């Protein structure tokens, strides 16, 4: 399983497969630099990173105002089906400004594939993306090498000092192929599946992202949500080792209302430290105005009901529209002000 693979910038605008071999090109090759790696690196040393200080400004504002992410934070997308998720992803690659875009699709379907690499195709930013895959139709070792591969992809492009962000798409089925695999050899499953390396192998994936003294790589992690929440433990597993999530909704999709976040349920464990001290007061101004807005749910009525509708209207954003920090504090301050008031 311990695999060394080809990275470099060959690879920027190239499709790999779980090996490192380029299947496919959206664009010309950038340059022929590479070097081979473990793909199964241990993280830095706690000792040798910097702490999550500068944000990352994601172009979203409902991200920006009441979420903002950190350069080097390593965030959640907790979504079921039809939440909207992987058009949230195009628009954070969209929006974002970073050197390097690094994506690992992990047990997704082939037409799933195929279909984000023909998104990447249309991006004006195509050369900075690395797409790595695995498809259903591989073991699940290979399902595993995959996020590990993308994920020392965006490793030496921090080392080239280049700001990196890394996609993982289920991390749940990262999770159960490092279950599979350990399963697959000698090893004991009576925790709920999982034996004990899968346990110890999770925060070994999700450690080597964050920043270093100059390059980082900025990470997103998705996360199903099955459709029950009553038997829900790798989720809740997963969340304790994130420095914050991103919570996606049945029901604002079901509404149509994009980019389907229920910022009740989200946090960045990095706002009060990435935030100046003037937004930060506005987000929890906004916070209790939203909780107060959906605790009243059951013309001092019709004043609170046209403000849940202004709310919740710049709260949603197509993936075309684009909002600077400046403007999302901008409304963020109007939203507080309903709140003095
Ligand atoms: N600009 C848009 N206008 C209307 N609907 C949109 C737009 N962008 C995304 N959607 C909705 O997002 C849904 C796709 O969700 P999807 O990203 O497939 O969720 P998941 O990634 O969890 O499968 C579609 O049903 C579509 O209605």
Same mark, same amino acid.
């Given at each position: !399983? ?15 497969? %779980? ?12 340059? %022929?630099?590479?070097?081979? !790696? ?35 934070? !390593? ?22 400004? #970073? ?47 995959? +996020? ?5 992809? #965006? ?23 490092? !279950? ?15 034996? +004990? ?35 829900? %433990?790798? +989720? ?43 937004? #930060? ?36 954003? %197509? ?23």
């Amino acid at each position: !399983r311990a695999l060394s693979a080809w990275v470099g910038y060959s690879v920027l605008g190239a499709v790999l497969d %779980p090996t490192g071999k380029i299947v496919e090109r959206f664009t010309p090759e950038v340059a %022929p630099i590479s070097e081979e !790696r473990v793909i199964d690196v241990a993280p830095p040393s706690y000792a040798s990173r910097v702490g999550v200080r500068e944000p990352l400004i994601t172009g979203v504002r409902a991200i920006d105002g009441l979420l903002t992410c950190g350069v080097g934070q !390593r965030m959640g997308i907790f979504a079921s089906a039809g939440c909207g998720k992987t058009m949230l992803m195009h628009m954070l690659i969209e929006q974002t400004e #970073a050197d390097v875009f690094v994506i690992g699709l992990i047990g997704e379907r082939g037409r799933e594939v195929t279909e984000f690499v023909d998104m990447l195709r249309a991006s004006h930013k195509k050369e900075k993306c690395v797409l790595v895959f695995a498809t259903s139709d591989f073991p699940s070792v290979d399902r595993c090498n995959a +996020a590990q591969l993308a994920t020392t992809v #965006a490793e030496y492009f921090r080392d080239q000092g280049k700001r990196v962000v890394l996609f993982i798409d289920s991390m749940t089925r990262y999770a159960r192929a490092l !279950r599979d695999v350990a399963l697959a050899s000698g090893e004991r499953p009576a925790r709920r599946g999982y034996p +004990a390396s899968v346990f110890d192998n999770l925060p070994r994936l999700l450690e080597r992202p964050g920043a270093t003294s100059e390059g980082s790589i900025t990470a997103f992690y998705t996360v199903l949500l099955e459709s029950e929440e009553e038997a829900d %433990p790798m +989720a809740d597993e997963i969340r304790s080792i994130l420095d914050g999530h991103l919570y996606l909704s049945r029901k604002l999709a079901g509404q149509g209302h994009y980019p389907a976040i229920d910022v009740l349920k989200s946090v960045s464990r990095v706002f009060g430290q990435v935030t100046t001290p003037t937004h #930060a007061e506005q987000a929890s101004a906004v916070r209790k105005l939203m909780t107060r807005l959906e605790e009243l749910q059951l013309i001092d009525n019709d004043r609170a009901m046209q403000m849940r509708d202004s709310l919740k209207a710049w709260l949603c954003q %197509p993936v075309a529209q684009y909002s600077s920090f400046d403007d999302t504090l901008s409304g963020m301050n109007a939203f507080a002000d309903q709140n003095s008031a």
